Design a protein around this ligand. Structure first.
Ligand SMILES: Nc1ncnc2c1ncn2[C@@H]1O[C@H](COP(=O)(O)OP(=O)(O)OP(=O)(O)O)[C@@H](O)[C@H]1O
Ligand SMILES: [Zn+2]
Lengths: 304, 660
């Protein structure tokens, strides 16, 4: 299999387009990356019309020789790391599913499915409710729910890409000495980032984009998102990651997350209106008024 | 083997036989490949390598080769191509495919053959001056498309089968104008029934068109001449019925029984097989420039666009470069630039469509260079149509219904607004026009569509067009002591559809007159018509452009085309309260004292102008500067159309919004 997003349930062009690794290695958010991808597809010998067809209805001859075409061409563009081995499960005259696609469908089912304290309580209740929707999809009888999860995953990844290009083009990322800050205050569809998993998706997109950047640094990142209804920011701290294909000389116990201790230290000393109640200690909910001072304290907190 | 010196001497008393000899055709191919690989221009960059690189990216099937390049070096091959096109083109296509398979190996799975499109042939003929000496040679002819047959599949490798011997005949290349005639069998040794060998065959796209002579070329008062042109694959549907085109092709002859029967002499029919197509509809810049499309860009040109797009004050230079020889009238130039770049159309949930084009009106005194500005807009725009006054009708700016001469069914034909889809329609002397003809554009100005219900045809067309109109006030001159509604005859329904209105007044001022006269006299002095010389001409023509144009016009045309084609800015973060307050104030100050209709339709024009100013910078997001500039433009367009009594108060009242 390949490090491609939902290959067997979408086109080949879509798989190459919405991939974190390909986007990091080719910078598809601007025009140059799209032109480079078109040049690659032209060189490989696959017509642009054929690469946009559904996987089931794709040409048999092209599908048969995909491995050789990948092996002989992927090295020129630095994408030789997309080839790997995985696990594929098939049940009768139904169709093949890979483990990666299954976990993305499950995550999509988790994310979307189905006076401020009550507002937060209803959101948490819906998040609890989504658990049974994800639970039902593990049974072989309920395949329509798995298909629904696949569609939801496609839509969610499209939204993440759309927000990420806006973040990257306007230079919203601010490089402080200790960490890198990104606060999303205005824009469309900020109601998708009230869920921690969607913000983790966007953070994984940004970290993947930064890891392959020629700039050599390992600073942690802070991602903040506003909810108008609750007037609260949801703030998450994300650890840096080494490049995927880098050697094992640096390999060790991975970089440690130090945001929990810093958040507890700042919360204890000052009477900030923060909520640290999630299982993940790196995700907090801070009132709108306290965001700008609190972060300043974090700048002097250290351990980051 | 032979040498380029040895191709000069000719044998067989015919050039075609000399070219088709096996030893000559091996030197020709090598020389053509060396020309393709090793040619460099003045700057030192190989152009055909870049063209081949772009070909695979775009999944193109054709290559464009300039005749001047192949004539400057290897002139013998240029002469051979000029005299004998058919045999040279077969070899040149093969060498082109071989050169293409050096950048994109395995490209044969996309396209199996590469076609070559010749450009900039030196000699241009008219249809009236074609004679028999031009038979079987490459020619360049201008004309006007009249009628188009439509696309049908045509056989490429024709096969035959004979039953009594069961023989299958080898593939035959069809002439595309003469039916393949076979009567002898290699095996049957006698006449036998021949089948078409059903299935297992290769087809091509075929189309036919008729070119009349252009009215400008035809001598005044004489009948035009027409000819037939065959368009093969990759060239179908490029030309449209009504456009004016230039075709490079091969002039051929064929035997027709009816022509011999009627005339009474053994005369032959002629037809042109098209090789290259260039559009000339609205183009007056055909005097210079090289290529098949002067609105297309290369990679280095796109890089230069992105380089000059990040300079501060690009909008100011773009505005200053509009109609450079006209002095003053900067608001008109700003409106023209905003209309040229345009806005962004929108569709909300697939049920609510919002227009994204800016319309401009110019109402002014005589002798203020409005028509010259319209002509400049016609020249710069990619697609432009021109009309004036009583010379246009209700169905001449719209779709008309005609009986097809062949099919004999009622059919729809195009018009001025349809010929300028995604373009500009210019209407000079817009007030000296019938009301029935003027009211035909009401649907196209806002809904951007045309609906016809005539003679059993019930259809809706699409006209995404922008209108820049010029008019004269009542009495020929503007009374500044009167409101707008009494200086024009147009009513509210047509005045609301315009985005920007420019009132041009001529006033007595000694210093202004002196400056205008000095500028005009200097312009007349400049325009007086009295290494390689053909590049000395270019450098001298650039020196004159240096003074009054911050950027060259040829660069600006491609800049505008690229900006319109690629960029689509959005409005994520912006100040809603300022726009709401401005709209409410404008609505209040209209009924109280004013005669300029303001509705919800004028709220969206500010956003459209903001998106246009964002496009000017090649940015994907609208900032605060662009929105503020749009608000300032809209406010200045409203204040200066008032009476002299209340203008000073209105300007002061509206001055808080435009602080910058
Ligand atoms: N700054 C200028 N203002 C006005 N006219 C100018 C200027 N510079 C040059 N001219 C010349 O003045 C002449 C008058 O222009 P033009 O014929 O367009 O006037 P008009 O009254 O707007 O025309 P029309 O009635 O055809 O719309 C033209 O020859 C034009 O080139
Ligand atoms: Zn036979």
């Amino acid at each position: 299999d390949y490090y491609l997003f939902l290959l067997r349930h979408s086109s080949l062009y879509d798989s190459f387009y919405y991939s974190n690794y390909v986007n990091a290695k080719l910078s598809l958010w601007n025009e140059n990356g799209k032109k480079r991808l078109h040049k690659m597809f032209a060189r490989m010998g696959i017509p642009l019309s054929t690469a946009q067809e559904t996987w089931l209805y794709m040409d048999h001859s092209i599908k048969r020789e995909l491995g050789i075409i990948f092996d002989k061409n992927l090295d020129r563009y630095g994408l030789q790391d997309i080839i790997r081995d995985g696990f594929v499960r098939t049940l009768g005259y139904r169709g093949s599913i890979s483990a990666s696609e299954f976990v993305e469908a499950l995550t999509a089912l988790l994310e979307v499915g189905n006076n401020s304290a009550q507002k937060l309580t209803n959101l948490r209740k819906r998040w609890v409710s989504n658990f049974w929707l994800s639970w039902d999809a593990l049974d072989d009888r309920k395949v329509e729910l798995l298909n629904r999860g696949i569609q939801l995953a496609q839509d969610l990844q499209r939204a993440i890409f759309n927000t990420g290009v806006a973040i990257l083009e306007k230079k919203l990322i601010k490089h402080l000495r200790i960490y890198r800050l990104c606060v999303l205050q205005d824009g469309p569809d900020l109601d998708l980032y009230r869920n921690p998993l969607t913000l983790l998706r966007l953070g994984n997109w940004l970290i993947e984009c930064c890891a392959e950047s020629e700039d050599k640094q390992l600073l942690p990142m802070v991602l903040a998102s506003i909810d108008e209804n609750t007037d609260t920011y949801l703030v998450a701290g994300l650890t840096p990651r080494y490049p995927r294909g880098l050697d094992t000389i640096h390999t060790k116990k991975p970089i440690l997350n130090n945001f929990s201790m810093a958040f507890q230290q700042i919360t204890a000393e000052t009477d900030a209106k923060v909520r640290i109640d999630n299982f993940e200690s790196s995700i907090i909910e801070i009132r709108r008024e306290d965001l700008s001072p609190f972060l300043e304290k974090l700048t002097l907190s250290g351990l980051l | 083997e032979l040498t380029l010196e040895s191709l000069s001497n000719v044998k067989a008393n015919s050039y075609s036989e000399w070219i088709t000899q096996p030893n000559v055709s091996r030197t020709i191919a090598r020389e053509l490949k060396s020309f393709l690989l090793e040619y460099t221009d003045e700057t030192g960059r190989s152009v055909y390598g870049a063209r081949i690189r772009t070909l695979g990216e775009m999944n193109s099937e054709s290559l464009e080769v300039n005749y001047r390049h192949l004539a400057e070096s290897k002139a013998i091959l240029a002469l051979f191509l000029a005299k004998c096109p058919e045999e040279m083109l077969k070899i040149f296509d093969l060498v082109a495919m071989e050169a293409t398979e050096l950048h994109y190996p395995d490209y044969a799975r996309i396209h199996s053959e590469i076609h070559v499109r010749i450009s900039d042939f030196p000699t241009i003929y008219s249809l009236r001056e074609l004679r028999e000496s031009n038979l079987s040679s490459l020619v360049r002819v201008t004309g006007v498309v009249t009628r188009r047959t439509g696309v049908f599949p045509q056989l490429k490798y024709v096969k035959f089968n004979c039953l009594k011997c069961g023989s299958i005949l080898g593939p035959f290349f069809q002439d595309s104008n003469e039916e393949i005639r076979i009567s002898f069998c290699t095996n049957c040794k006698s006449k036998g029934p021949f089948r078409v060998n059903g299935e297992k065959t290769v087809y091509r796209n075929y189309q036919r068109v008729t070119l009349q002579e252009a009215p400008g070329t035809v001598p005044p008062g004489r009948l035009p001449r027409h000819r037939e042109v065959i368009l093969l694959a990759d060239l179908v549907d490029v030309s449209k019925p009504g456009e004016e085109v230039e075709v490079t092709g091969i002039y051929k002859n064929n035997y027709d029984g009816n022509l011999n029967a009627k005339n009474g002499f053994p005369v032959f029919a002629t037809i042109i097989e098209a090789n290259s197509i260039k559009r000339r509809e609205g183009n007056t810049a055909n005097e210079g420039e090289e290529g098949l499309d002067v609105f297309s860009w290369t990679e280095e040109e796109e890089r230069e666009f992105r380089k000059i797009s990040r300079d501060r004050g690009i909008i100011d230079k773009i505005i200053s470069s509009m109609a450079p020889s006209i002095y003053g009238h900067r608001d008109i130039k700003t409106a023209v630039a905003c209309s040229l770049f345009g806005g962004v159309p929108k569709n909300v949930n697939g049920k609510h469509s919002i227009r994204g084009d800016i319309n401009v009106l110019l109402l002014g005194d005589p002798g203020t260079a409005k028509s010259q500005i319209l002509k400049y807009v016609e020249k710069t725009a990619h697609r432009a149509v021109f009309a004036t006054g009583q010379g246009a009708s209700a169905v001449g700016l719209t779709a008309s219904v005609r009986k097809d001469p062949i099919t004999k069914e009622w059919t729809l034909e195009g018009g001025a607004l349809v010929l300028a889809d995604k373009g500009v329609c210019l209407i000079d002397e817009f007030d000296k026009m019938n009301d029935q003809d003027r009211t035909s554009i009401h649907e196209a100005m806002e809904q951007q569509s045309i609906s016809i219900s005539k003679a059993g045809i019930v259809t809706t067309l699409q006209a995404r067009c922008s209108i820049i109109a010029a008019a004269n006030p009542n009495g020929g001159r503007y009374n500044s002591t009167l409101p707008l509604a009494q200086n024009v005859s147009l009513t509210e329904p047509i005045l609301s559809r315009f985005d920007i209105l420019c009132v041009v007044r001529d006033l007595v001022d000694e210093e202004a007159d002196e400056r205008l006269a000095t500028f005009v006299v200097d312009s007349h002095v400049r325009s007086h018509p009295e290494l390689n010389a053909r590049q000395r001409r270019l450098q001298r023509q650039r020196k004159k452009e240096e003074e009054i144009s911050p950027i060259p016009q040829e660069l600006l045309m491609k800049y505008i085309h690229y900006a319109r084609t690629k960029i689509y800015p959005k409005l994520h973060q912006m100040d809603m309260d300022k726009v709401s307050r401005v709209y409410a104030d404008l609505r209040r100050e209209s009924i109280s004292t004013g005669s300029f209709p303001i509705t919800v339709r004028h709220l969206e024009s500010i956003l459209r102008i903001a998106e246009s100013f964002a496009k000017m910078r090649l940015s994907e997001f609208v900032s605060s500067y662009d929105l503020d500039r749009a608000i300032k433009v809209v406010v200045d367009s409203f204040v200066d159309a008032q009476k002299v009594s209340v203008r000073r108060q209105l300007r002061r009242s509206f001055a808080i919004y435009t602080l910058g």
